[PDB]
Write an enzyme that holds these catalytic residues in place. Structure first.
Site, PDB file in Angstrom:
ATOM      1  N   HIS A 133       0.988  -0.953   0.143  1.00 35.99           N
ATOM      2  CA  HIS A 133       0.024  -0.208  -0.029  1.00 35.99           C
ATOM      3  C   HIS A 133       0.998   1.682   0.265  1.00 35.99           C
ATOM      4  O   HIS A 133       1.490   1.533   1.204  1.00 35.99           O
ATOM      5  CB  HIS A 133      -1.013   0.025   1.088  1.00 35.99           C
ATOM      6  CG  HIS A 133      -1.486  -1.120   1.341  1.00 35.99           C
ATOM      7  ND1 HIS A 133      -1.532  -2.128   2.878  1.00 35.99           N
ATOM      8  CD2 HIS A 133      -2.643  -1.891   0.597  1.00 35.99           C
ATOM      9  CE1 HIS A 133      -2.320  -3.418   2.138  1.00 35.99           C
ATOM     10  NE2 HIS A 133      -3.040  -2.541   1.572  1.00 35.99           N
ATOM     11  N   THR A 134       1.198   1.562  -1.252  1.00 35.37           N
ATOM     12  CA  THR A 134       2.254   3.539  -1.447  1.00 35.37           C
ATOM     13  C   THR A 134       1.759   4.084  -0.083  1.00 35.37           C
ATOM     14  O   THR A 134       2.749   4.794   0.290  1.00 35.37           O
ATOM     15  CB  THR A 134       1.677   3.414  -2.502  1.00 35.37           C
ATOM     16  OG1 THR A 134       0.842   3.529  -3.416  1.00 35.37           O
ATOM     17  CG2 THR A 134       3.037   2.126  -3.568  1.00 35.37           C
ATOM     18  N   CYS A 135       0.510   4.176  -0.219  1.00 35.67           N
ATOM     19  CA  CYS A 135       0.224   5.487   0.102  1.00 35.67           C
ATOM     20  C   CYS A 135       0.324   5.557   2.033  1.00 35.67           C
ATOM     21  O   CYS A 135       0.450   6.286   2.666  1.00 35.67           O
ATOM     22  CB  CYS A 135      -1.579   5.719   0.385  1.00 35.67           C
ATOM     23  SG  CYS A 135      -2.303   4.364   0.783  1.00 35.67           S
ATOM     24  N   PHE A 136       1.089   4.293   2.232  1.00 38.37           N
ATOM     25  CA  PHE A 136       1.357   3.936   3.926  1.00 38.37           C
ATOM     26  C   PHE A 136       2.548   3.343   3.498  1.00 38.37           C
ATOM     27  O   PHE A 136       3.138   2.886   4.775  1.00 38.37           O
ATOM     28  CB  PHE A 136       0.486   2.968   3.982  1.00 38.37           C
ATOM     29  CG  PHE A 136      -1.074   3.275   4.361  1.00 38.37           C
ATOM     30  CD1 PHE A 136      -1.066   4.641   5.892  1.00 38.37           C
ATOM     31  CD2 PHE A 136      -2.432   3.418   3.792  1.00 38.37           C
ATOM     32  CE1 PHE A 136      -2.456   4.717   6.265  1.00 38.37           C
ATOM     33  CE2 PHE A 136      -3.315   3.359   4.451  1.00 38.37           C
ATOM     34  CZ  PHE A 136      -3.783   4.452   5.499  1.00 38.37           C
ATOM     35  N   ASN A 137       3.201   3.535   2.530  1.00 38.00           N
ATOM     36  CA  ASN A 137       4.451   2.895   2.342  1.00 38.00           C
ATOM     37  C   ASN A 137       4.060   1.461   2.462  1.00 38.00           C
ATOM     38  O   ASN A 137       3.747   1.243   1.624  1.00 38.00           O
ATOM     39  CB  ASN A 137       5.783   3.469   2.904  1.00 38.00           C
ATOM     40  CG  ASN A 137       5.976   4.685   2.769  1.00 38.00           C
ATOM     41  OD1 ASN A 137       5.933   4.551   1.213  1.00 38.00           O
ATOM     42  ND2 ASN A 137       6.264   6.194   3.425  1.00 38.00           N
TER      43      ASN A 137
END
EC number: 2.3.2.26
Length: 378
Positions: free
Chosen positions: A352-356
């Site tokens: 999940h890139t928005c949370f790394n």
């Protein structure tokens, strides 16, 4: 097929595109204290073929032993001036320092459209110089939004770009629409803008008649994609067109079509300085069994230390949205990098890139960890 094949093919083209554009010498007199302004003055009369010439950069009142030193410093310094957001030629969607950079529709008016043409020629010059051989490499120093990279390739906008380009907007509005009923939200295919006194200033429709079109469960995906088109492309249409006009003088637009968004970053910016020690020292392991935290994770770090520099770059894109760390390294990540123990067994890793965050299942052998991590980044 492979990324290196694309690079080798692309760079050989480009050498053929510029084959009767000699690498003769040209002088650029610039000033360290007014670098962007003086560089625009130095190139104001350059023809298209002049941009293929050997750039001999003279920093005012500075002596140098060779031309390569000043040239490499000029490319790095001009990239920062163009893309690091300070002068607002490019901007970020959240006032954070990991945030990827995007063309700015609401920039100071003194930044005219022809500056995006210069930025496009500069990026094209980096690609051209790097295609002449390893000794002439000039990497683009920028962390671009995925949607801007998609616009360079000529792709249509998709709401998936919000996760990397505007993570806060993705976590709030986009994820809510993707997971919830729309019957009571009373959304229409239009955006409302308010002045500083809280009055409705302007209504911008996402398409003709959009203000009279309700958002329903059956069309909410089309709404999100039209939202991405408006917020990431339509508002910077002229800026992107002038950027592409400058870029296409050195790199014909048909040549970049063989890359996707992430590969375009690797081509422009390189595989990066991914320190596995900096990675391990700043990654937090969340949860997991004893077997996961003490055996699987040891296998994981051994795999990461065995990855090629391109695979490392793709792992960071997979988990953070860019192959380049923010200025401060792994410590500068939005939320600190987390390796979450997934409640699955022998499945494919997710992110999940928005949370790394990297979501890692449990595995039974080292070679299983090796196999699955390469698949997830393939």
């Amino acid at each position: 097929e492979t990324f290196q094949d694309k690079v080798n093919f692309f760079q050989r083209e480009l050498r053929q595109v510029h084959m009767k554009r000699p690498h003769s010498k040209v002088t650029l007199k610039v000033s360290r204290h007014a670098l962007l302004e003086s560089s625009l003055k130095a190139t104001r009369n350059f023809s298209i073929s002049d941009w293929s010439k050997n750039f001999e950069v003279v920093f005012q009142d500075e002596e140098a032993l060779d031309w390569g030193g000043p040239r490499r410093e000029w490319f790095e310094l001009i990239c920062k001036a163009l893309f690091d957001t300070t002068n607002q030629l490019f901007t970020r969607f959240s006032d954070n320092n990991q945030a990827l950079v995007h063309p700015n529709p609401n920039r100071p008016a003194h930044l005219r459209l022809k500056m995006y043409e210069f930025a496009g020629r500069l990026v094209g010059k980096c690609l051209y110089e790097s295609s002449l051989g390893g000794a002439y490499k000039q990497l683009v120093r920028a962390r671009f939004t995925r949607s801007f990279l998609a616009q360079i390739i000529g792709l249509r906008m998709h709401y998936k770009y919000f996760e990397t380009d505007d993570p806060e907007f993705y976590k709030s509005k986009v994820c809510f629409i993707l997971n919830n009923d729309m019957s009571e939200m009373e959304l229409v295919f239009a955006e409302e803008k308010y002045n500083k006194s809280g009055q409705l200033d302007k209504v911008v429709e996402l398409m003709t008649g959009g203000a009279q079109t309700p958002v329903t469960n059956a069309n909410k995906i089309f709404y999100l994609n039209l939202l991405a088109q408006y917020r990431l492309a339509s508002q910077v249409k002229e800026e992107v067109e002038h950027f592409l006009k400058g870029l296409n003088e050195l790199v014909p637009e048909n040549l970049l079509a063989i890359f996707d968004e992430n590969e375009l970053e690797l081509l422009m910016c390189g595989t990066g300085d991914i320190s596995v020690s900096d990675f391990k020292a700043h990654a937090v392991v969340v949860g997991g069994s004893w077997h996961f935290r003490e055996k699987v994770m040891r296998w994981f770090w051994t795999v990461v230390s065995s990855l090629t520099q391109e695979e490392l770059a793709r792992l960071l894109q997979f988990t953070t949205g860019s192959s380049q760390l923010p200025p401060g390294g792994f410590a500068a990540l939005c939320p600190s990098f987390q390796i979450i123990a997934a409640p699955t067994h022998s499945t494919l890793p997710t992110a999940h890139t928005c949370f790394n965050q990297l979501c890692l299942p449990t595995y039974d052998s080292y070679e299983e960890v090796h196999r699955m991590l390469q698949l997830a980044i393939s």
